[PDB]
């Protein structure tokens with residue numbers, strides 16, 4: 001279950017952290033990962049879990065490694081190694097310079113101009129969901145809002161039918177938080193196979209949706225191939241169907257549990273964008289990594305060619321060296337430092353869509369359903385993985401306190 005220590009890895013750096021089932025999970029997932037930042041724990045450790053890999057535990061090291069693509073390559077960015085080796089998504093599995101032509105196309109389909117284009121749709125969807133939900137006095141938040149709000153927006157953006165959401169959500173779940181029904185590679189291939197006939201249909205007759213744009217793109221002075229388009233659309237789907245969905249649940253769980261923080265935003269709505277950034281720091285949720293292109297000494301530690309190193313995006317903003325009292329949510333925090341959207345050349349291009357979705361959710365939910373709580377009895381369970389998430393979030397409220405605008 002624990003893989004034997006490789007000869008080059010010193011024993012005193014061993015810390016057996018399981019990224020898919022961390023010891024302290026019951027305390028909350030961010031808290032569970034934060035054990036890597038207790039004072040005894042070295043800045044850079046090796047876990048024997050999940051095949052054996054390095055973990056950088058401080059924001060300083062995490063940022064530094066993400067800037068150095070020469071040594072820390074994204075060709076194999078997932079743990080376990082078998083998943084990383086099968087990982088061939090575009091642009092994420094590519095380093096500069098090769099990454100750049102494909103990254104331009106990815107940004108074209110999720111960037112700010114798309115957010116601006118979809119402004120009314122995003123607003124309308126949040127409004128419609130909340131209006132349907134508010135008179136009920138309860139919801140399963142993950143299922144009833146956290147999933148459908150960003151996913152319907154993504155399927156819209158992608159020109160894909162909503163009928164396919166359960167299938168696609170399942171497949172993407174398996175690549176970030178596998179339940180054991182599928183390997184990463186099996187889930188990837190299933191997603192690729194879903195997309196290829198759609199890509200083939202849309203290559204011929206080009207359109208406005210993300211899949212058409214990718215499929216009709218130009219890269220390296222030539223048409224993008226169907227297979228390249230497949231590798232990129234696959235990534236876009238993983239990106240569009242997981243991170244915002246799970247982040248919204250962390251944020252709403254917190255708000256459900258902190259009336260004082262709800263009040264701040266209700267009474268001072270101009271603070272919502274800042275609050276969004278602080279929630280992005282505190283409830284950061286992504287952890288992937290890189291692979292060593294050659295033997296390299298890093299912060300006094302001998303990394304060997306082929307070693308995998310987890311560089312948890314989640315940990316930077318929780319580092320007390322970066323943010324004092326890091327587990328405390330302060331919407332008035334002066335310098336919100338985080339790498340929630342990553343760092344280096346793979347810095348998330350979808351972050352503007354994400355922020356808009358978070359901000360619209362905060363504004364509309366908190367004003368229409370200002371007063372809500374976790375259902376009595378309930379204990380909220382988190383799950384850990386490449387993207388961490390909330391399993392279920394039962395909320396209750398008095399419908400009489402709710403607003404239609």
Ligand code: HEM
Nearest residue numbers: 091092110239240243244247286313341342346348350354
């Ligand atoms: C709270 C929301 C989000 C979070 C925390 C997040 C996080 C991240 C992180 C950490 C990376 C870099 C991974 C790495 O360096 O290996 C990334 C990349 C990426 N994200 Fe997001 N993201 C969010 C929203 C979105 C959305 C809404 C989309 C829409 C499609 C999206 C699309 C992408 C794409 C295409 C990449 C790959 C960029 C590249 O490889 O050059 N993201 N994201």
Ligand SMILES: CC1(C)[C@@H]2CC[C@@]1(C)C(=O)C2
Nearest residue numbers: 092238239243286288386
């Ligand atoms: C780690 C990510 C968040 C980033 C975009 C989707 C994701 C799961 C990837 O495979 C790359």
Ligand SMILES: [C-]#N
Nearest residue numbers: 238239240243
């Ligand atoms: C990005 N997801």
Ligand SMILES: [K+]
Nearest residue numbers: 006007008009
């Ligand atoms: K050793």
Ligand SMILES: [K+]
Nearest residue numbers: 075084085087
């Ligand atoms: K790979």
Ligand SMILES: [K+]
Nearest residue numbers: 169172173241
């Ligand atoms: K998913």
